[model samples]
Every structure is written in structure tokens, then in C-alpha cells.
Target: ADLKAFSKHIYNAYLKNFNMTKKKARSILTAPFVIHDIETLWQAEKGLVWKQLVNGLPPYKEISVHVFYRCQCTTVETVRELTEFAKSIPSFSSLFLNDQVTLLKYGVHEAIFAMLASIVNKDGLLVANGSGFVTREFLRSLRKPFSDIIEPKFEFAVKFNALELDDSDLALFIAAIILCGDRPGLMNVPRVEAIQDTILRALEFHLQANHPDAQYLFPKLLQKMADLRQLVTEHAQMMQRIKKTETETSLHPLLQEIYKDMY
Candidate 1:
């Protein structure tokens, strides 16, 4: 099916730059490091992370924001690749400007987390652009509210990795997420729904024929979509809390626009 060809193109685009498998990621990062206490974490950051730390103790809210910013910055280079991924899907670019914006706005975080499952494992998450790997023990070590933000991603990611999907699956999956009709204010739900349906059919059909070895994998993949939805929903909630409580810290405006519907 040409539909499958579309999926393969998108999948290869994703594979080219963003494929960060664990064995590959493991060699690239400095994992096994912990950051429990602010003082210690500050020492841990080499003082550059929260360069503008205040007197006495650094705030958890700021630390979380800082961590988010660092991770975000790390992805700046990759985002261009993501845009290229979108462009590779002619269906995506054919949408109106507002619809295009809406898709990218809501779908970015979800796609990021989906891609996340590729690199991350039960061991830990890569931070500072694969230069460092932050451990679960260290992430959990942060203060109550602070640690809460990242640990959930790891939790979801570990289970997602269990699905054993590769870039081909993820390509179709990310496109499907972007084409979803359910975002807060879609002007053309019917169109998105139709496109998403086609994409899903292509995915379900292709994997069915291709992976005879993996039964029930299609349903499992669908279930993972539901779980991915929840992960982003919770991530949006976390972002809202950060915006309210961590007023001193700033959010990336692009990421902020992505969360506009949450309030």
C-alpha cells in the first residue's frame, strides 16, 4: 500500500536522527549520578544549572523549571528534525495554518514522550542532551513537587519500551497523534479524524502483515496510545503547576503555547 510507503518514509525520517536506543544511549551518557538535596544537587550541577540561585536554599519549583529548560534546550536541534518529520507527511502540511499549529502545539509533548521510550529504559533517563543520565533514585530524591514531574515520564517510558516498537511503528504513531481530531479546539475534526483513521488502518494493516511473529501487538500498540495520552495529560497538569507556583522561573514560550488548553 502507498499508505505504508508514507509510513515507511516517515519512519525512516524518524530513524535517521532520533533513534536513541538504550545500548546506544548507555554508551553516550554519564548515568548512575544522583541529585537529592538542593545543596548537593547544586554541587551536582557544577553550579551552572541554577546559576542564579538565591540565598539559603534553591527552590524546588525553579529546579524543576531549570531541568525542563535544560531538557528542552537539548531538544532544540532535534526539533528541526521533528518539523522535517511533519513536512515529510504531505497530509500534515496540507492542513490550514491554525490546524497545523494546533496539531504541533498539542502533539509535541506526546511525540516527545513517545520518542522518549526509544532511548530510556528501566535504568534511568538521559539528560543534558545525552551527556548525562539521571538515575531514578536521584530523580526521586528531589523535593516532593520537583521530583514528581520527571519520574512519571520515566514510569510511562519504561512500560512503553516493553512494547518493543521501532522507528517504523513510532513514525506512524506520531503522525497518528498529530492527526488526532480530539485536541481542544480543532476546526475540522472530521478531516483530522479521517486522516487519523487512514493512518491507523495503514499502521494496523502493515504491522499485521509484517509482524506475524508479534500477535496482539496492534491492540497492544493501541493500548499504549491510551497510556501515552494519559502521560501527556499528566505532563500538562504538571506544567500548569509549575507555571503557577514557580512564577519566578520562566517557561519556553513555545512550550507554554502547547499548554494553553490545560487551564
Candidate 2:
């Protein structure tokens, strides 16, 4: 099937699932404005967690390696102390390292570890392999909760288009369509151009909206855009160079192979 046909099929399936209201689905398909808000919520949630863990606690005492060794205590004790210290601090109350340990002990460490792993520094004060330890435990803790939250969100997002697909997914889909010539096996330059144009327009529209949470993602998005643009430009330039270097009488085997392939 061509990409257009596949897309149409998906759209029809989507409509059928949603009571055949194309207008309603189209309205829903319009990119979500709340995407920014949801991102902001996630960032805020993350910040809250960090505030409770790092900034909320006392500055970690820089104990010498020798002192650390002499203490004869596991890093777990250090984590516990950090948690207790954070809780003792006046007016800080969200999460503590000790809480993470408790969660780990109880086999609910995933969420706590997820939050902790996000804030841990590269220096490994948390433990020798503290970040890894925390992350594994945290992910374990989060498995059940994350599954519960994400499954429904995914279903709803696909149905309502209220949850925008991540940029990575969007990019992958576009590349697949371009390379595979959109399910119908029509590998025409014009169609590729049109799809690229449409996607760029959609992206422009998405970027123009007010996203309070965009502040957090701005750097990442910009970096990704720049990287993608650079990659495409480099590929185009390399292809042009290759074509120019090839003699008119001599066929480049690779180029011939590419042209012969339907996709």
C-alpha cells in the first residue's frame, strides 16, 4: 500500500473506532494545544521531586575517601542519612533518599529511582554505581504505576490526538515514508517533496503555539532540528558530489542500484 493509502486506511480505522465522526476526529486530529501544558506539568513534577531530593536537603558533606572507608558503612547508610537530613530541613517535604531506599526494600523503587536518577551528578556521590542502582530500583518501582498511566494515555492520545507524538517518532515516520515511498511503492520526487512540505508546515504550526512547558524543551528541540537539518543537507551535498564525480560514460554501481530499487 502507498503511504497515502495506508494513512487513509489508518484514518478510516480511527474514524470507525470513534463512531464515524470524521469532523470530530479531524478536530481531534488537529495538534493538541495542551501538549505544552502537559509537558509543563511533567517538568514541574520533576522539579518538585528534585527540590525535595537535592536542593531540599543539606549540602552533601564532602567526606574524604579515607573517612568514607573508615566509616565501614555501606553507601546505603549514606543514602539514608541524606534522606533523613533532607526531611529534617525545615519546610522541605516531597521525597527523601531514605524514602527511595525504603521503596527499594519494599520493591517499589522504580518511581523514586526514576526521579533520583534524573538529579544525580556524574561524580557518583550517591554510590560507586549509585546512579545505576537508583535507576534500576526506581524503574522497578515505576513499572506498575507507569504502565497504568501510559497505557491509557497512549490509547487516548491515538484516539483523540490530544497527545502529540514525540519528535523522534515523527521524524522516524517521515523518514520511513520518504525512503519507502509511502506504502504505494510510488517513489516519485514530487511526492517526497510534498510530504516534506506538509510535515514542515505542520511542524511550524505546532511550534507557533504558546507552550509554557516549552521553556524546558526549547534547547532539546532546537538541537534536534539543527542536527536533522544538518544531516539532510550533508546527505544532499554528498549525493551531488557523488553525481558530479561520476563520468557520464561510467555508471556508478551504487547509484544504479539505488535508482533501480522501487523504494
Candidate 3:
């Protein structure tokens, strides 16, 4: 409908022109994990390919190494897109810089988990930026303690996807997540709160028209948001652990900035 009608055009060209989609699935698990040569690591780092050859000689890495960089790069891209999505909302950019940062700090993970729902199915996740789809069994097999950092997100995504929200629905919902007034330490809490209410109103109104027979959808989405909030809290705790001693760069530096700055 009118992405720009009555305060609809309010989307700052960001969401209005966005390109992410519920891409159809294509599984690339035919072969085992492999990194052909020592040079492939740097190649992967520079973003050459999602996967390399079958084996790497000593002093090189195996599939996990390829997987790690793939995962790391995905984390970075997610943040970049998260920023794009948030900034696209007119209300989000209208907030003061610190307020914007604060909301992102508290809300980025929520949006990530919410959007993660779009790409997930009953199987697992589309890792390596959607080029490779991994299975639930494979993820479980890998000992994802931290590797499974996204495990919880995957679980939530599966259930959330059950709602079958479209991209337009998600755009508004994600905007609501970023504009939350309850994020703590807001310069203008009332304004942000009001904006979120407006978003919720629009969302509820649109949901009725968008998913007519699915009357319970609007409320279900509300509960899903609450669930996302809870999920991200746990995610933040886990992120802290990785920041302190793990790969140190496991979480993107920009995300670290948002998290540390939020605290």
C-alpha cells in the first residue's frame, strides 16, 4: 500500500528503497568443510568467496576457520544493514545522536533476531550471508557453545517465522524496536516513547489490513517483541564473554561500540 501515506512516506528512503528479502532457500552442504590453501584465509578475509577448497596444508585452517570468518563477516554486514534500517526510519534519525546510539545499543540485537526470522526455516540458518544454508543437526554437531552464539536466535527465529510476517510488516516492527522509549537513559524519553506508540499504532492498523484473517497477528507480534527483548539480554551477556577473552573480534567492532557505549 502507501509506504508513504499519512506519515507513511515518513520512511527515510532507507526502508522505502531497501533490498533485503525473504530469499528462497538453497542448501550448499554437498561437500565437507574445506580451505584449500594458506592464502585462502586472507582471501576469505577480503571477502573473495564464502567457501574455499577441501583442505589447507599445516599452518593453515580447516572448515571451521572458513566458517569463522564467514560468520564474522556476516556479523559485520548485519550491523551495517541494521544501521541502514534504523536510519531509514524518519523517527530514528530524528533522535539526537546519543539517543540514536542508545536505542541502537539496546535494540540492534532485537532487530537482528527479528530479521533473522525472515531467513530461517525449520532446518537451521542461512550462514555466510545466505550463500550457505546450514542444518540444525550440523549446527548442533559443531559444539556451538559460543559457536552457537546464534543458536538461541535461531530458535526464536523459527517460532517467530511461524507468524509469517512480510517485509513491510517487519520494517515497521523493527522501527518500533529502535525507537523504544524504555531503552534507559534517553535524552527525550517522552518523544521517543510517543514515536514508538505511533509506530505501534501504524503497525496494528496495518496488520489488520495486511493479514486480515490473521487477527491474532498484531498481538502475537507484540509478544514476539517481548521475547526478542529477553533473548537479546542473554545475547548481550554472551557477547560480553566473547569481547573479554574469545576471538576478541568475534563481535564486530561497531557492535562493540554500540554495546560498550550503551553501558
* Best candidate, TM-score: 1
For model 1, the superposed segments whose C-alpha errors exceed 4 Å read 16-65, 75-80
Q: For model 2, how does the per-residue alpha-carbon lDDT over 165-262 read when each residue is reduced to its tens digit? A: 33222332222222221223333435444544554443433444434344434344434434433343343344344345522322234323322322
Model 3 CA deviation exceeding 4 Å by range: 1-18, 23-68, 244-251, 261-263
lDDT of 3 by residue, 1-263 (tens): 34336235544343544444553332332122222333433444454334333242223344444455455555556767777777776667888889987887788778877877776776666544454456655545543444567578778977887887776677788888888999887899999999888888888887887789997888898888899888977877776776676552444567677667433
Native RMSD of candidate 1 (Å): 4.6
What's the residue-level lDDT of 159 in candidate 2?
32
Which one is best on lDDT? 1
The TM-score, computed over Cα atoms with residue i paired to residue i, of candidate 1 is 0.80
Q: Of the pair 1 and 3, which is ahead by lDDT? A: 1
Worst 10 residues of 1 by lDDT: 49-58
